[PDB]
Amino acid sequence: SLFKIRMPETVAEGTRLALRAFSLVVAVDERGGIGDGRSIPWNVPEDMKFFRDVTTKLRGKNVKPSPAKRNAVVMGRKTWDSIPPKFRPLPGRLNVVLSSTLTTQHLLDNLHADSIVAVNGGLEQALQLLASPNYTPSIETVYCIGGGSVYAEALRPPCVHLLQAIYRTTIRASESSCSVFFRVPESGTEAAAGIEWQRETISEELTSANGNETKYYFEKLIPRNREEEQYLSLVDRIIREGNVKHDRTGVGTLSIFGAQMRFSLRNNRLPLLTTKRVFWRGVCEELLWFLRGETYAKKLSDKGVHIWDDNGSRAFLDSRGLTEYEEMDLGPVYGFQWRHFGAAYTHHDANYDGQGVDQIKAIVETLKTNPDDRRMLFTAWNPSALPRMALPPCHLLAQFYVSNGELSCMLYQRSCDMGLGVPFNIASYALLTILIAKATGLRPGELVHTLGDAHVYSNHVEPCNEQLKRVPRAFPYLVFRREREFLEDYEEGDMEVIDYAPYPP
């Protein structure tokens, strides 16, 4: 007992008050107008249906959204009025109206069902409230539905940065008399705020069954994800240009040598790959495992994480000359080296308190006292210990760096499978940083990822081409439901990763 690493008092100076990411639904005329002062000028029933369906429907199979798992819509006061009483409140969804004249009760009235909440501030507060401990597991996607004033805030920092998709219905009607305006800025413009907007989908031109045979079309717009895209263009480069190589088993690979990647961890954005679902539950579970200096791999198994299972079998241990290790015991691997570098190993049950160099601790120590130190790095690559290990480490090195009170972290990895190894490990180090940040009272900055031998497996090739066809969506956020007294005492339950919107596992 301690020995452990003790967490600081408050959250990091000028810190991220946990927000929620959102999506925006809007209809415009060709000029980009939304409603002549109050309300809306045109009448397209097809938009209404398309509105209903976007706002209601959850991810997955035919899963009716009960209060226990549902979607939420955010609107200003004027719009909430604008909705006809026959469809008020909006069914299936959590009507969220911001107001500074009316309260939650003050709005409830025909009668009488509690699917609404009024909020005292703007969009930020909504997102804060929606990301708040109870609302978060229950509420899947947030949608902003208008109007002008609410949209203004959406395309303004720091909302615009939490803005993750725009569904935009264009109406082929035209007059000048429509007052307010909504234009998505072109990329690389001042108004763009450095965001790059792309078409993800776009419907046919369609004609409305209303009174004027008026044309309309749909389109989904997403904020281009350079970060994830660099990962992909590395995969493509390997496939096109990699050297054919053959590993220890004998499987064929394509590999390149030496590359570098970066990912913003700012405001707990978390680079889980969109183009393919990552095993976050395992990621998180394994790293906390690492952080304790753990070794008995069945701790992971017991918790439904089966990866060290292959390398933990009686067979493989023996195949690696580890007679004396009981099944699922790995020796001085990763985390052990992290916390007790150079400590002589015997078995996993054995007490390792005080033996060997506790790198992580000393790092946490230096960070707080002396941020400018060019020596804050831990290693798992111990030549003397390597033979006693079930597996030499891939991610063998990490160096920390601090600027503008933000913590960055370079990770070095000698052998990198883009297939799953890599995306997994990116998430893994992203978490470490965020945690270490939290432990040293700093905001998180960048993860820099340096790859040694980067490879794709011979089987993986064609699969990977399927992945390369997809566009990367925006990244999710790590948010803490709870904090702990000691870093070591953190658990998967304590955090929850919000707004992860991938494509199939």
Add this chain to the structure above:
Amino acid sequence: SLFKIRMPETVAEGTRLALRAFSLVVAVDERGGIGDGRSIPWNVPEDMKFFRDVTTKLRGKNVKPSPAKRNAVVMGRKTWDSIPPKFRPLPGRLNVVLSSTLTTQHLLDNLHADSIVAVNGGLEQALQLLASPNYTPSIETVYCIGGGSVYAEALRPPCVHLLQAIYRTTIRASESSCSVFFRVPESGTEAAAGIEWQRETISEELTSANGNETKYYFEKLIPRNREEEQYLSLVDRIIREGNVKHDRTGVGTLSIFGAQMRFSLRNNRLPLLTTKRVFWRGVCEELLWFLRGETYAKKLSDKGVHIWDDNGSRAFLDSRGLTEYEEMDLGPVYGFQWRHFGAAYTHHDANYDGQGVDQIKAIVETLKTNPDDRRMLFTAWNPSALPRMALPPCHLLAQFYVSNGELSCMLYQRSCDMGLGVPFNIASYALLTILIAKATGLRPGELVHTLGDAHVYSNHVEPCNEQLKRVPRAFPYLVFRREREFLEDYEEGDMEVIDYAPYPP
């Protein structure tokens, strides 16, 4: 004794028969023509003087070129004839005429002085012969002076790649009747062979004191050095965008976090920076020092290398809590960790044979037997040894990789001074690779350089701006005058770095 690493038998399969790099002098009309069949059409006396001076004059101060240190000109047979007997042979220079009809003696005739050599092949053989053990220290720059046939070979692989500068005199004369042609290809064209040609200098338009008041101008053309340029654009990025930081002494720095560089080591090209002269003699001396697992820093001092001098003083050792170490003893630093990782240190004189993990050896071992291994990496970052060291390592990690029978090598460095640290270290690892290549019977490939904290010192800033004004020239070549029985037994004398053409120290 051995213990050591034993060198292989022959040189690496399909290997670089040591060549010399050269420069090209040529005159053209505006159409790019050089001489109507045999000889030259126009008469410009100013070209002749400019020819004389380029071909004769050595680098440095008023140093008359004696046979002991001089310049060499390479010409085909027809040109050697073309020279009028009153200036034959060309004075101050080693007239080198290739022929397959006439020999060295066969050409000597008025009479009678031995400043010439005939060669049986083309330009390659010339360069080979000029880089040959005796001719190399003595002969400073090689110039190719024509004609058509010799120029053809110059702009052809693999000469064009050893081609390092073109001095081109343009004559503002015009007819069609000039037969042969000389055009430098535009960059990114087929004919360019992937080389990018740039103007380094260009004179005034000038009028010849000959019979027709004919115009002419000069210009120097160099093959753009992307490689070195990446180093520079990193320096500029730091200066423009680096975070102000303050190191352990207290000096001010500008730093960035995490970057990556590459350098071709192919055919023993050696990335010594042109934009500022590097201390090669020290580089080479220190790395061989490393390679032996050496520690008594005075071995370097004795050999006129004073860098470990500051960190080796009685003072600094004491300042680092090293009472027991005699002056100029550093503890388990760099090379020691390389050769005896984890060996318990006592003093430099003490025998360390057989103790600790000999990384380098095992690497050399694996390379030969199993090139596809993703584990060939040595480290100097030993947490248990760090406190006993006078200095923690900057270059703490190197991983090797083999493709197409070429050896590449990634180097990881945690703290990087662009001022001198970096350029020095690039050369340092380039040498290691070349040597390790030689030890494992492989050709050398790429050095990949990964920088952690990259910085420029507060003083260094303005100096560095002066450097940034320069254009990087082409890189030099490492060539071996002699080989050794064991890797350890190599010496600075054994090799000689040819064609290093910088700007002031």
